[PDB]
Design a protein around this ligand. Structure first.
Ligand SMILES: *C(=N)[C@H](C[C@@H]1CCNC1=O)NC(=O)[C@@H]1[C@@H]2[C@H](CN1C(=O)[C@@H](NC(=O)C(F)(F)F)C(C)(C)C)C2(C)C
Ligand SMILES: *C(=N)[C@H](C[C@@H]1CCNC1=O)NC(=O)[C@@H]1[C@@H]2[C@H](CN1C(=O)[C@@H](NC(=O)C(F)(F)F)C(C)(C)C)C2(C)C
Lengths: 305, 305
């Protein structure tokens, strides 16, 4: 029993983390094979960041300007290129701790573990969701950029996120490992708006299923509803519309618990319309949308790596 | 910015995790130097667990009965002893990934990272608090026993917890690494009561400090109060009394924010007496007591390892 916000083991990823210094600026890099990936804004001074010309800034840099450190050991940079908002620094050494990995672009509503790092050293691990507006609600300070988000499939690390930017609202934006931002964001120190955010409806239902599994069943009603009837209510309370693809994804949880997806939608309707009456669900006084169906199955049946 | 439930990096600990099988029963062991630590109830069949005589059960066991596996590799057990509720299995090999470590007995209210494992393989990481009643609110299934809780100080792992037991209420109990339970618990399959739990008052204040740092300040009043005046209210709402040792521990957070500890106590009094009125603090609709002062400083100023 129990249900927590649980990150992947970070070991495989801790071994890829390096420090990248250019002039005065230091942040984190990801060392895979003979290549180090970091945010391109490492080349900036503080004045450049207000409106940088990254091409012109990079032109004024050679390989010896890039100090890459892995623990106490320096790596010799033998090449450099800019791919979108990331820098690829070729080094003379393949990382001997390179795990099996891939680069993926994650869809909104999916989750990942963040290994938050400073000076190329790991500080902490937590789980995030990519929000419908392509922000994340992270925990990041000066020096955190280059920190990555990832998923693990048995022994294969899917890197999906690298950290670049904190919005005025204190939420976060970054890129995939090819340097393409998630959302409308750019790497310049200026106030930038995120969308109106929505609630990830499929995740909420997954978490209701996690609650039932763990015995919290007070919210289960006898009533039912349609897909259409539910979505009309969902629109009202700023929830993602529920698709059939979503219903089918919730199938494992439906199957395990013996509560149809549409009956669970019935429960959520009542919850939205009546509130919680000061009661809790899995220790939460509000409705959590940062667990995928797979996160719930993984945790409530104990998938390992 | 941002503030999340953040565990230590788990790499150092992932390297110490092994699988221990006795007869039919399999759980996790902790492999440090030439010694493997696991819960003693690995020697039990399902019938024994209702009321085990651990001494008599262990007597009928020799070294070859203990299958210890580290990945695909078997370790030859050359000795065995029972220390309280843990089994120490001497093996022929020192773990080459043994980190600097210590064993500590943690105080109620303190936090730690759990690396939840099955079949000696890591599944995930989360943070827990030791509750005043010596239970933890974990996420644990069949096979999770042997999973450990730990803290990290630069490069030194303090192991403080090993998992044994889930109460009827779905919370959890276990031992230190010398096999002494936290709380009144025993390793037998019988319903066991935990204390009335209390709220860890020092942690709540630490988390209010985390909120202010992050810009949640709506709950700040310009009142202050005495220590005694606060404690009177605290007793009422089932909060731990606040001591001067507690005030002194909050000194760094007081210092960082420039809000006196007793002015913050003023805010918490009003919060307890009025409730939150549907408002949130760091995304939470209730008051969180599972962050220590050190956890807040670690996160809101970026301590690494
Ligand atoms: C990477 N090390 C940081 C991550 C930041 C630091 C504070 N918390 C974080 O998550 N990246 C940056 O500092 C980037 C960097 C210049 C400005 N920047 C920002 O994140 C800034 N944001 C904005 O300008 C704002 F608020 F308007 F959106 C900052 C004020 C420093 C938080 C560049 C090149 C974009
Ligand atoms: C270790 N592998 C498990 C951890 C459990 C399994 C489900 N969730 C957990 O955290 N340990 C056990 O199964 C221990 C073990 C026998 C029984 N036991 C229990 O935790 C049981 N609890 C009780 O008897 C209860 F609820 F009354 F307190 C169980 C019902 C299986 C959850 C021994 C030797 C104590």
């Amino acid at each position: 029993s129990g249900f927590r916000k649980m990150a992947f083991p970070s070991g495989k990823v801790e071994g890829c983390m390096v420090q990248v210094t250019c002039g005065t600026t230091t942040l984190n890099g990801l060392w895979l094979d003979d290549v180090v990936y970091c945010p391109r804004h490492v080349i900036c001074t503080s004045e450049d960041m207000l409106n940088p010309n990254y091409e012109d800034l990079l032109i004024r840099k050679s390989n010896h300007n890039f100090l890459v450190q892995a623990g106490n050991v320096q790596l010799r940079v033998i090449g450099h290129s800019m791919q979108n908002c990331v820098l690829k620094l070729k080094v003379d050494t393949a990382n001997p701790k390179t795990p099996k990995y891939k680069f993926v672009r994650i869809q909104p509503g999916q989750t990942f573990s963040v290994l938050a790092c400073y000076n190329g050293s790991p500080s902490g691990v937590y789980q995030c969701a990519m929000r419908p507006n392509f922000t994340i609600k992270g925990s990041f300070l000066n020096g955190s950029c280059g920190s990555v988000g990832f998923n693990i499939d048995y022994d294969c690390v899917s890197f999906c996120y690298m950290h670049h930017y904190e919005l005025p609202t204190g939420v976060h934006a970054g890129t995939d490992l090819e340097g393409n931002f998630y959302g409308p964001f750019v790497d310049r120190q200026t106030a930038q708006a995120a969308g109106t955010d929505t609630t990830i409806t499929v995740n909420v239902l997954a978490w209701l299923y996690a609650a039932v599994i763990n015995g919290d069943r007070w919210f289960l009603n006898r009533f039912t509803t349609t897909l259409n009837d539910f979505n009309l209510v969902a629109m009202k309370y700023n929830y993602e519309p529920l698709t059939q693809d979503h219903v089918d994804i919730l199938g494992p949880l439906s199957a395990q618990t013996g509560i149809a997806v549409l009956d669970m939608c019935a429960s959520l309707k009542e919850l939205l319309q009546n509130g919680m009456n000061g009661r809790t669900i899995l220790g939460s006084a509000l409705l959590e949308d940062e667990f995928t169906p797979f996160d719930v199955v993984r945790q409530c049946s104990g998938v390992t790596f």
